[PDB]
Design a protein around this ligand. Structure first.
Ligand SMILES: Cc1cc2nc3c(=O)[nH]c(=O)nc-3n(C[C@H](O)[C@H](O)[C@H](O)COP(=O)(O)OP(=O)(O)OC[C@H]3O[C@@H](n4cnc5c(N)ncnc54)[C@H](O)[C@@H]3O)c2cc1C
Ligand SMILES: Cc1cc2nc3c(=O)[nH]c(=O)nc-3n(C[C@H](O)[C@H](O)[C@H](O)COP(=O)(O)OP(=O)(O)OC[C@H]3O[C@@H](n4cnc5c(N)ncnc54)[C@H](O)[C@@H]3O)c2cc1C
Ligand SMILES: NC(=O)C1=CN([C@@H]2O[C@H](COP(=O)(O)OP(=O)(O)OC[C@H]3O[C@@H](n4cnc5c(N)ncnc54)[C@H](O)[C@@H]3O)[C@@H](O)[C@H]2O)C=CC1
Ligand SMILES: NC(=O)C1=CN([C@@H]2O[C@H](COP(=O)(O)OP(=O)(O)OC[C@H]3O[C@@H](n4cnc5c(N)ncnc54)[C@H](O)[C@@H]3O)[C@@H](O)[C@H]2O)C=CC1
Lengths: 320, 328
């Protein structure tokens, strides 16, 4: 009887990889149409790049490199500060999924059993097995154990079987982020490939074609608003967000900007944890339910991967 | 700009009634096709069936007054069944001095009348509640936005409320700690009425804790002799993932064990599982709120876990909202 994993972002799939390497069967669930979560699903509108500071995660990254799914990104970086643009070089090693940030999670998932477009609404156990109800009122199960791998505010609904755990998870605040993508037929006449931005609706922007293995046909840029701006405009329409963030971009850019060939906006209500944690994972081993996600640790790709490893590690130890 | 109310059980609708009596506009939301929540009546080949709440008591003066208005409007009646008790393997009459009320012609008639022509969006499962600088917004399961709204009242079972409270994590953490017990219900219907005077029974030492006879209730469809069976939360937990057919089989058996007359195969049978049937314990909150932010929470689980507790909770949530407007 398989282990259910709810959420197919990096935390869920990291857990899935660990369980499957150990010879155990899983079944993955995601309310979305594909996997990846906040890494985006297979223009990189979500996570833009990641660092590896933890040796275990660094080892995982070298594995992905050897598989052809990540490469190093070394953009010409800028800072926008007090209304002026300046180069901001550094020696930070940064990684991207290749050919897109989505390739990492797509590879982790591989051919594992998965139910997409399946929003889980309830998680409950009988005397032996776990069961999931989805938004269509269809039952799924039996399952031997359950791993919740969602943003904290979306996990709370799935933890009704362990109210003390639910209560802890419910306290975890996540900030929203609006993202906008713009694509141009004629490349913008600048050497800038990325910018850290202050005193603006924006805090980050990136040039996709500067990333290894991307399609160079259009010059596409990703704009990420600050969480403060995002909150202030949380219920804005996509078109309004595009207009404001496109404007913020035109304001700071040092060159002409033609009309884009297309423009996109995407809102994450639960983009990132407001703070850091050291839990790693949360679990109720007695009941058989485990919780992981970036918000159990540092709120970065590395934190998500590590959190899912820890949940799996605990599950496997209790399978005994 | 109206006040959003998520949940159209009696708590949500009690809140709605109070706000509209005070001259404020609301818009109701429910994931179900209709209102009533755990009071709603099931339509079926065997008539309207009160598969959730079976009867209620009124102990609070304020609620009794409401019940009497409903009575005078024809939507509730005092129910006077021959009640029995099943204990240590024997059936005996269990008359008492408690007044019990039922909706007429079905339990759903109460909430239906409370909702009236208030604006409502049915089949609309709210998944996220968030605010911009001025207004509140609801996202549903179809990813469609609703708003703007001036304030939000959550009137769902606690475990279902927690997901809607992310804008107020301190509040969510409180709500998330509230445990609710499950209940399995079964309905059985017979072509020939069963030859017993029993119209309702409190049951101990059994998978069942309650059963009631529909033909003993005013205004029901008498065609079939229908009975509603409620399992204990303990049996319900132990069998929480049983199939509808297994539940019917077991509870039917428990009923056949206790009945004092012959019982033929029923002509029809239904089972319904409530994950969050009632709060595991009592509370005294009345309602919970982050008024500064404009979000309020109510439900049976803020008080006693009964129809009265839900109604009162909703009244309290509205009263708090109305009192706070002067500070906004
Ligand atoms: C705009 C943005 C930019 C970012 N930039 C960076 C960056 O530059 N570097 C960095 O390190 N990190 C960045 N992050 C963070 C990084 O993307 C996350 O830390 C990581 O992707 C989170 O992984 P996760 O598995 O914890 O959860 P997620 O990626 O959120 O995946 C959770 C999954 O669960 C699913 N789900 C939710 N509820 C349910 C349900 N009820 N039923 C079924 N499925 C459900 C979701 O659809 C989702 O697929 C960024 C995030 C955002 C939003
Ligand atoms: C089997 C059973 C038997 C009972 N018997 C009795 C009895 O004999 N006497 C008694 O006093 N009480 C009884 N009760 C309790 C009584 O039914 C409840 O206390 C009362 O009806 C609860 O009402 P409420 O408004 O608080 O919530 P509910 O009646 O649960 O209404 C909540 C509403 O919110 C909706 N909802 C939930 N989540 C969402 C969402 N995300 N988006 C939109 N809508 C949503 C639901 O669909 C529902 O309509 C019983 C309950 C059960 C389950
Ligand atoms: N927008 C969102 O929703 C989310 C964004 N993130 C972002 O993920 C990114 C990766 O974080 P880390 O792995 O710690 O990477 P990192 O080593 O690039 O450090 C991140 C922060 O350091 C500063 N910084 C680094 N190099 C700089 C330079 N050359 N010039 C000026 N400032 C510089 C920036 O302020 C940046 O936010 C961060 O930018 C973080 O804010 C993380 C989670 C969610
Ligand atoms: N699993 C279930 O059946 C569920 C039941 N409920 C019921 O809602 C009920 C509402 O009760 P109240 O409004 O206080 O009504 P009530 O005054 O009838 O009290 C109900 C309880 O009192 C006892 N009782 C009362 N009169 C009795 C008699 N004549 N003979 C034997 N026992 C008697 C029983 O234990 C019964 O459960 C709760 O007590 C609970 O039983 C609520 C949710 C789920």
């Amino acid at each position: 009887v398989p282990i259910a994993i709810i959420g197919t972002g990096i935390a869920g799939l990291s857990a899935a990889q660990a369980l499957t390497s150990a010879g155990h069967q899983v079944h993955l669930f995601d309310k979305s149409r594909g996997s990846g979560g906040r890494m985006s699903s297979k223009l990189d509108m979500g996570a833009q790049y990641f660092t590896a500071r933890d040796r275990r995660f660094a080892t995982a990254v070298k594995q992905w490199q050897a598989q052809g799914h990540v490469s190093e990104w070394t953009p010409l970086l800028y800072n926008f500060h007090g209304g002026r643009l300046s180069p901001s070089p550094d020696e930070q090693v940064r990684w991207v999924g290749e050919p897109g940030m989505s390739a990492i999670t797509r590879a982790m998932r591989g051919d594992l059993p998965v139910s997409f477009s399946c929003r889980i609404t309830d998680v409950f156990r009988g005397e032996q097995h776990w069961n999931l109800l989805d938004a269509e009122s269809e039952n799924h199960g039996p399952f031997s154990h359950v791993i919740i791998a969602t943003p904290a505010p979306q996990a709370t609904a799935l933890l009704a079987a362990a109210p003390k755990l639910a209560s802890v998870v419910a306290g975890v605040k996540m900030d929203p982020t609006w993202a906008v993508a713009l694509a141009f037929e004629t490349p913008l006449q600048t050497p800038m490939q990325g910018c850290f931005v202050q005193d603006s609706p924006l805090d980050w922007l990136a040039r996709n074609r500067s990333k290894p293995g991307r399609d160079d046909t259009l010059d596409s840029w990703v704009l990420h608003a600050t969480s403060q701006w995002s909150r202030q405009n949380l219920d804005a329409s996509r078109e309004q967000v595009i207009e404001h963030l496109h404007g913020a971009f035109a304001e700071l850019i040092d060159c002409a900007m033609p009309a884009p060939v297309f423009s996109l906006a995407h809102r994450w209500l639960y983009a990132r944890p407001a703070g850091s944690h050291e839990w790693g994972a949360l679990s109720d081993a007695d009941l058989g339910i485990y919780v992981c996600g970036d918000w159990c640790l540092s709120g970065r790709v590395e934190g998500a991967w590590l959190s899912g490893q820890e949940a799996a590690r605990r599950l496997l130890e209790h399978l005994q």
